[PDB]
Amino acid sequence: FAVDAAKAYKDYLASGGQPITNCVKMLCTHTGTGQAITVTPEANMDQESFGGASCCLYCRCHIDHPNFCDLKGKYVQIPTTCANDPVGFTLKNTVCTVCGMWKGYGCSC
Amino acid sequence: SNSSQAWQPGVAMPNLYKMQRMLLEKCDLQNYGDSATLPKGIMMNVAKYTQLCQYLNTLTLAVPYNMRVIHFGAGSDKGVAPGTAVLRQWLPTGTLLVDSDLNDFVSDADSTLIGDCATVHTANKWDLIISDMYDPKTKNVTKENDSKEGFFTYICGFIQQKLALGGSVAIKITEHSWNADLYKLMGHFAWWTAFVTNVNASSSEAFLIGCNYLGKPREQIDGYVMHANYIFWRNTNPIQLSSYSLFDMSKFPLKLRGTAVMSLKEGQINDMILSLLSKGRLIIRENNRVVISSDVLVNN
RNA sequence: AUUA
Ligand SMILES: Nc1ncnc2c1ncn2[C@@H]1O[C@H](CSCC[C@H](N)C(=O)O)[C@@H](O)[C@H]1O
Ligand SMILES: OC[C@@]1(O)OC[C@@H](O)[C@@H](O)[C@@H]1O
Ligand SMILES: OC[C@H]1O[C@H](O)[C@H](O)[C@@H](O)[C@@H]1O
Ligand SMILES: OC[C@H]1O[C@H](O)[C@H](O)[C@@H](O)[C@@H]1O
Ligand SMILES: OC[C@H]1O[C@H](O)[C@H](O)[C@@H](O)[C@@H]1O
Ligand SMILES: OC[C@H]1O[C@H](O)[C@H](O)[C@@H](O)[C@@H]1O
Ligand SMILES: [Cl-]
Ligand SMILES: [Cl-]
Ligand SMILES: [Mn+2]
Ligand SMILES: [Zn+2]
C-alpha cells in the first residue's frame, strides 16, 4: 500500500478544490533565463519565481518524496497565467532535461 | 512616500539619537498599524526580508567562501519560511543556511531544527545570525515595559559564544520585544544600528544590526537608555510606508567577497587584526565541519 | 511579530 498524494490533489482540483496557498513568491528582475528549476530566481517577463519547498506537494503535506526533493532549496519558475496554483503546475508538467524549461512553455522533448 | 527616504529599503536610527539619554516612553506612531501596498501577490515577510537584505548590502559584511548563516524564528503561521527563501536568494550559492523555529514548517534551508531556540547547540561559529523571533505573550502588556529574557538570553549567549569575529547579526525587536544586554552587545561590533524596513514603517519593529563582531567592548552602551533613545527616535520621526525599493532587484544578490577566514587565539588579536575585522576584510573561526543539534526532553 |  502507498498513498498517491499526486492523484489525490489532481482529483481535489478537478472537484473545484481551492489550490494550495502560501507558495512563497519571490521579488526578482523578471529578466532571468526562464528555466523551470534554478539555484536562484530566474523568472522571465512571462513568469513568477517561487521558493521551491513551498511549491512541493510532499514537503507541504509532510509526506515521503517519490524516490530526495528536487524543489527544496531551489526556485521554481511558473508561467504567470498558472501562478495561482504552483503546486499543481509542478505536478501536471515536466522539465526538458536538455533545455531546462517546461515542456510546452518554451521547449519540447 | 515622497521624502527621499521613501526610495531607500528603510531608515537607520541616526547617530545623534543614539547619543541621547531619554527616559522610556510609550511608543505612539502616527501611522500605527497602516498597511503597505506591496507588489501583487508578494507576502509581507518577503518584502520585509528583501528590504533588510538590501540594507545589509550597504554595510561592510564579511562574505567568505562557504559562508555560514543561521536564521532563528524562521517559521510562520503559514507553515512556510518566507524569510529563509529571501536569505537563500540573497546569499551566494553554496552558503550553508540553517534555520530554526519552535513550530514545524517547510524550509529552503540546508538544515532545519524544530524546538525552543534554547535547545539548539553547535560546536561551530557562524558568519551571520538573523533572528525574527517574537514571543506571542509580549502582546499581553500588563506592567512596565522592562527588558525581556526568554529567547533574548539565548541570543546574547549565542552571539558571545558562536559568532565568528568579523561576523554580523540582525535581531528583530519591537517596543515591548527587546533586551538591554542585546543593546549592550551592539557595542562589541565595529558599528551598529536599529533598522526599520520601509514596508513596515507603521510598526515599532526594528532590526538591531551589529556589523563586524570584535569580541570586546568598543563602546559602553546602557541597554535601557538605548531602547528609550530608539522609541524617542520612532515617536518623533514618522516614516512613510514605502515599497519603492522592492521593484529594483538588479543589485540584490550579496557580493561574494571571498573574505579571508583565519583561526587565531585571543592573544593574537592585535590592533592590525581589529582593523581588518572592522572593515569586513576578515573572519576569525575554525573551518571544520558544521554540526548542529536540538536537545530533546524525554517524557513517559 | 507572522501587513492588508
Ligand atoms: N523561544 C523561541 N524559540 C524558537 N522560536 C521562537 C521562540 N519564540 C518565538 N519563536 C518563533 O518566532 C516566530 C515569529 S514569526 C516569524 C516569521 C518568519 N520570520 C517569516 O519569515 O515569516 C514564530 O514562528 C515563533 O514560533
Ligand atoms: O500558493 C499560491 C498563492 O497565490 O496562494 C495565495 C497566497 O497565499 C499567495 O501568497 C500564494 O502565492
Ligand atoms: O532613485 C534615486 C531616488 O532618490 C533620490 O534621493 C531622490 O529623492 C529621488 O527623486 C530619486 O528617485
Ligand atoms: O565607520 C562606520 C561605518 O562603517 C561600518 O562598518 C558600517 O558598515 C558603515 O555603515 C558605517 O558608516
Ligand atoms: O511558528 C508560527 C506560530 O507561532 C507564532 O508564535 C505565532 O504566534 C503563531 O500565530 C504561529 O502559528
Ligand atoms: O499603502 C501606502 C503606501 O505604501 C506602499 O508600500 C507604496 O509604496 C505606496 O505607493 C503606498 O501609497
Ligand atoms: Cl521576560
Ligand atoms: Cl552586496
Ligand atoms: Mn505591520
Ligand atoms: Zn519536497
Author numbering:
A (entry chain B): 4272 to 4338, 4342 to 4383
B (entry chain A): 6797 to 7096
Would you copy out the relevant sentences from the publication that reported this structure?
The best resolved and most complete electron density for capped RNA was observed in crystal #2. The position of U2 in the active site is “locked” by multiple interactions. The phosphate group of U2 interacts with water molecules from the hydration sphere of the metal ion and the side-chain nitrogen of Lys6844; the O2 atom of the U2 base interacts with the main-chain nitrogen of Asp6873, and the O2′ of the U2 ribose makes direct interactions with one of the oxygens of the side chain of Asp6873. The phosphate group of U3 interacts directly with the side-chain nitrogen of Lys6874 and forms water-mediated interactions with residues Asp6873, Lys6874, Met6840, and Asn6841.
For coronaviruses, this last reaction is catalyzed by the 2′-O-methyltransferase (MTase), a heterodimeric complex of nsp16 with the activator nsp10. Our structures reveal important information regarding interactions of nsp16 residues with the capped RNA, the influence of a coronavirus MTase-specific four-residue insert on the conformation of capped RNA, and the role of metal ions in 2′-O-methyl transfer.
